Design a protein around this ligand. Structure first.
Ligand SMILES: Nc1ncnc2c1ncn2[C@@H]1O[C@H](COP(=O)(O)OP(=O)(O)O)[C@@H](O)[C@H]1O
Ligand SMILES: Nc1ncnc2c1ncn2[C@@H]1O[C@H](COP(=O)(O)OP(=O)(O)O)[C@@H](O)[C@H]1O
Ligand SMILES: Nc1ncnc2c1ncn2[C@@H]1O[C@H](COP(=O)(O)OP(=O)(O)O)[C@@H](O)[C@H]1O
Ligand SMILES: Nc1ncnc2c1ncn2[C@@H]1O[C@H](COP(=O)(O)OP(=O)(O)O)[C@@H](O)[C@H]1O
Ligand SMILES: *CC(=O)Nc1ccc2ccc3cccc4ccc1c2c34
Ligand SMILES: *CC(=O)Nc1ccc2ccc3cccc4ccc1c2c34
Ligand SMILES: *CC(=O)Nc1ccc2ccc3cccc4ccc1c2c34
Ligand SMILES: *CC(=O)Nc1ccc2ccc3cccc4ccc1c2c34
Ligand SMILES: [Mg+2]
Ligand SMILES: [Mg+2]
Ligand SMILES: [Mg+2]
Ligand SMILES: [Mg+2]
Lengths: 372, 372, 372, 372
């Protein structure tokens, strides 16, 4: 065998490529868009649906919907369209020769992984596959075997702690607040500036505002008083129609939802308390190495200043006689994929695949007695 | 103090009166009309602008514009003219003795409420004021403290779920489709009968057609097939020039835009799905009392048969093991004003006003830390 | 200043007088006649030209020509002779002390009004002047501010719709068919009785036949069949030489040209259809008040039975569910002058004059940016 | 099948020809004239009605009337005479062998398209037909699939936004101001020079003045001040009798009605604001390509300098950080016909005709469910 496919199906983006590579060769959004309007010039390249980058380019006339919602595939008819887009148009490979490596979040429903396995063998006919946990791959991309991982993507935020290669599944804290809910809260608090974003095509306009104008304030209540003298905390954004918008305290107030989830109305804890509660559910001896290895991942942890407040606010919870080290790599948008590329190229992993002859004798129940 | 003023500045009409009354003493449209013509006979009572009922009578020579558009006051020079018409010519009171009660929609821009507060203290010099929420007052007029309120007026449609007096601001679904957009869609689909209504003076002719010839079909595709045998579903209307028109399927097809917003080209859900999506964003425990208390309000919910389809189509979305009760009072055109009259007469409310000495030291930012 | 002059320069007659008077003190025809014969007895008061009533008396030896043709002054050398006759011989006043009020028709050429202004300042030296519209003054004489005005004099027929003192200049219809063309058609259809009227002195003989023998038939095709038994519809007229003439169907057939302009070969509508087309070019809201106020004026509308057919035939065009009221005052030969006498005696009009110091700084272009 | 007929029934002209040709083989006005006079020499080829070019030659003795008025066929007895003139005298083909392609304006009455379909199958008996939209065919003639189309012809001005072959029918702005109303306004403002054009035979004399003496001023108020020194902005025209007329500011003041519709008394926006309001009703993502593709069409957009002011005045409304490209082809009088010739010659279109066996089973309601 030459290579192996590593397909990280996130809620927002699809990262895909080959094992051994240090960067995915296919990054495109998880969008399947149907045209909503009439259509008069029938022909000249009008498809029934648009997937990925072509749905992002033609997004004005399309109803964009994402098949993966909070890490759970709810649109299996359209998730097959993204995989059909992935292997045949973004990578130009046939899946019959390459073993694929899929990922998913922990504490996921069992019907999600059983149908990822069923489609990869019956539709695409892979030689073998494997479904890994995203937070465990992200720790392995950083060259560690010990550390609690804050993987926060577009659909889910989870907090898997790992000590010396042993997962502690009773301490995994799955939170369904991620970059999608911070986008939907930014759409809510831009209406108080008279900025109406309503359709799902302006959902990516507000998402692009969030990716280049939002930051995490070190102290939120002192930053709100600074924004009362609204001069220095205001930046302008260029809308695609040529309009400009001026946002002030809305820059730092939507990443505050990661730390105060009561803004979108969730009876829940912040990402700093669910990190602290996940350490305090582990054993007393291994906490010394978990406060020292706080690896962040995903795209939601790419805010300017999120690692500074993450250290500043766990230290307010942890006992002061020990150190807190937040690990923020610069490549952590792709660290779940990078850990998948190292894993699929290991020689000690080559006997841990789920082959075709193991699937048809035991059905879909083979995929649950393999992980953890 | 004897009485207080309750001014409901809707997008279409202005309701105004006194606290304790059961009906407003001043109902007139939110119209400021300028003359568009020459004016040869200079004098004999030709004013520069006509406001309210006098602009509705002289509407054939006036360009009618509304200062409130989708619940947002965009014409602050002309909104003061309606308030100058309201307190001085419709109520004949001086605002220096009476505390006023204004209303607005939720998820409104912050500059809208600040300039309502600034004009009511600097121009009219009220003793105290308070800006309430329209859907919360409509529930309080119905004698309830629990229920989701579909307040669809002339400018905006919005759902506010309230449970035991606690508002859930993360579940408020604001939708800018309302009775104005159903008037502009009825103007669009009367052109297929050869009926040309173009200027803003025929905008109230088409609006008057809508208020007495339109109904909500219980099943739309069966009603369109019934209207193919176009005999029983046609009624005639008397235009002011003596002409008669005959409208058929256009009677029930413009209130269908409330339930299918794709007719006017909005990627949005109907009023039945934004009600269902607003209940499903509330907590699982309180949904039992929200499906049972569906209070409707505003003038747009006054169609014949709108409560019957609202119950028929939430039931298709809600689980069948529980009951749906759409509450449609017969006085629900004024229910936002009625709840404002009960609120301004409460003795437990008299300490919740925003007085003049609270405004001049704290500026316009006092009015945002008072509501919700 | 005590008084002000009101000079209505019609095509047929000159009405002149003072403001405040209820009747003009000078009514004489717009005639300047030159002698066409030898004149052997040189002297004894033989003037070079005869103006007004003295030309109507000596008309047998004169070539009578009218300087105002279809409301347009084409003979400015001879229009000054009528004005010189008017101020100095019919009113016996000097124009240097009295501000004059001139009138003209709508949709008139700009060189007509600029030369009325130039002659009234550079020849007669009035203190101030104003050129008004004839049909707007006729509505103001009737005490109305709303109504479409069928003004039909000797030179032109024109409709002006006015609503609440606001003229609608896009809906002004102007029709050059008037009482002069009905005189020239009566001269044509008297030749089939062998009555030869050829020169311009018999033009006033036929005009005097028309003013006391012509009537408007209620139904024309039934009246033509009634005149087959040519006994009851014939009346005799006394020519100035002593001859008698007997006219039958020619009594009602020339006022039919007002309603059927194809008799004199004009591709045009009647006065009932140009009234209806001028209402239907107005806005649809004000049509209810325009069908109910049909003020007629001029001398051409003095036919017996013109108001009965005007109501009978607009009703055939207007929708039947509304009323048509033709307003035919008995003084409507002078209603253009009467409205000018009320206007020049107002106090709100005294600042709307065109004074001498406004004319010499802006030239003749001052007179267009004040009226319409 | 050899060819297909493309008959563009405009309000002013009839363009007809064959599919594949680059120019129509039949251009003649939509005029049916009846003789209004006696006709003493009975015989020698005096027909009862004259259609098209033969009515334009004999127009002095005819009452010319238009069956198509504001894009609505109101004279179905006389519209069949133009089609009978078209296939049998201008093209010399029998319609039983050729499938025809008709056009009409958007937001047209339903009875207009049904009677086009009924007459083409019952009277002329075509094999198949299709009724298209005029503005969509004009964009397709320019080789584009994306752009907003200002198709201003003789009866109607309408904007249609099209993005990549998907029409947005909620953003179509239809305006009933076109070249006929600019002709009727020019007849009105030539009367202030003393030029009396009244009958319908001088309606084409004034129309021929407009087609070769009228231009669009870049700035209107500076051009009116330039015309005060009335030397350089005056040109002469040769009337058919031999008279010459000198027009000054009336050259550029009637195409100003396209940009200021208040001159003819319409509460409406100009063609630059209805273009801008139609873009601002589209989605934010597609506006970048609609401001860059402003395709104009029709004969009314053939004024010298209309594309320069169209770019100058949308730029005053659009945000300044983007480009506005008005597309003005030199062949845009026939671009609605050219796009119909390309469409009827396609092979992907040959299954979209409305055949005879589809019409007789479903009646005239087939023609509405095969558009947009
Ligand atoms: N550079 C950035 N800065 C801030 N936020 C970002 C950035 N890039 C992505 N995001 C947010 O993170 C989410 C993308 O995370 P992603 O890496 O796609 O996770 P997944 O692939 O698991 O969905 C998006 O919703 C986006 O809003
Ligand atoms: N009796 C009625 N039946 C149906 N629709 C109505 C009726 N009265 C008003 N409407 C519609 O509702 C709107 C008025 O709602 P209104 O109570 O004035 O709300 P708001 O005061 O918040 O503007 C108008 O646009 C009108 O078209
Ligand atoms: N009493 C009358 N009956 C019928 N026709 C009349 C009468 N008086 C005048 N006319 C006609 O009307 C015309 C005079 O109209 P007039 O009032 O002089 O208008 P103007 O002053 O604008 O010329 C004359 O041509 C005459 O033929
Ligand atoms: N060369 C021209 N320059 C200016 N205006 C023109 C020209 N040709 C035609 N027009 C005006 O455009 C109108 C004709 O438009 P046309 O292309 O016939 O549209 P349609 O075929 O849809 O009626 C006429 O009313 C005429 O006044
Ligand atoms: C289901 C699962 O957790 N798989 C998984 C994830 C990550 C990871 C990293 C490094 C590894 C080294 C050797 C073997 C395995 C096996 C499974 C595995 C990993 C590794
Ligand atoms: C801003 C706001 O929502 N005000 C508001 C609305 C409605 C309402 C109803 C009943 C109440 C009883 C007691 C106190 C208050 C206070 C505010 C208020 C209400 C009431
Ligand atoms: C040019 C013009 O139309 N002047 C005009 C005509 C008639 C009329 C009647 C009554 C008026 C009352 C007040 C002011 C004016 C001013 C001009 C005027 C009139 C009046
Ligand atoms: C009803 C209608 O809009 N038909 C229409 C108009 C224009 C147009 C242009 C180009 C096309 C290409 C392929 C197919 C079709 C089909 C219908 C059609 C068009 C086209
Ligand atoms: Mg991820
Ligand atoms: Mg309201
Ligand atoms: Mg007169
Ligand atoms: Mg055309």
């Amino acid at each position: 065998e030459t290579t192996a496919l590593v397909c990280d199906n996130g809620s927002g983006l699809v990262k895909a490529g080959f094992a051994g590579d240090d960067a995915p060769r296919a990054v495109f959004p998880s969008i399947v868009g149907r045209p909503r309007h009439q259509g008069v010039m029938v022909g000249m390249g009008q498809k029934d649906s648009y997937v990925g980058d072509e749905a992002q380019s033609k997004r004005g006339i399309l109803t964009l919907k994402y098949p993966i919602e909070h890490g759970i595939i709810t649109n299996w008819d359209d998730m097959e369209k993204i995989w059909h887009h992935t292997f045949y148009n973004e990578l130009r490979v046939a899946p019959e020769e390459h073993p694929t490596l899929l990922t998913e979040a922990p504490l996921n429903p069992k019907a999600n992984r059983e149908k990822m396995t069923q489609i990869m063998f019956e539709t695409f006919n892979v030689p073998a596959m494997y479904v890994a946990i995203q937070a465990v791959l992200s720790l392995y991309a950083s060259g560690r075997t010990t550390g609690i991982v804050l993987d926060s993507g577009d659909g889910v935020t989870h907090n898997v702690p790992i000590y010396e290669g042993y997962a502690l599944p009773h301490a995994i804290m799955r939170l369904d607040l991620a970059g999608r809910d911070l986008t939907d809260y930014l759409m809510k608090i831009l209406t108080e500036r008279g900025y109406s974003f309503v359709t799902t095509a302006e959902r990516e306009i507000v998402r692009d505002i969030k990716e280049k104008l939002c930051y995490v304030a070190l102290d939120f209540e002192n930053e709100m008083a600074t924004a009362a003298s609204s001069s220095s905390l205001e930046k302008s954004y260029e809308l695609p129609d040529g309009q400009v918008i001026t946002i002030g305290n809305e820059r730092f107030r939507c990443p505050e939802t990661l730390f105060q989830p009561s803004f979108i109305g969730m009876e829940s804890a912040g990402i700093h308390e669910t990190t602290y509660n996940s350490i305090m559910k582990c054993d007393i001896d291994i906490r010394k190495d978990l406060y020292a290895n706080n690896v962040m991942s995903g795209g939601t942890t790419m805010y300017p200043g999120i690692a500074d407040r993450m250290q500043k606010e766990i230290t307010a919870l942890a006992p002061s006689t020990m150190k807190i080290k937040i690990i923020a790599p610069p490549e952590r948008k792709y660290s779940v994929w990078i850990g998948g590329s190292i894993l699929a190229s290991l020689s000690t992993f080559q006997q841990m695949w789920i082959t075709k002859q193991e699937y048809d004798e035991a059905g879909p129940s083979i995929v649950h007695r393999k992980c953890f």
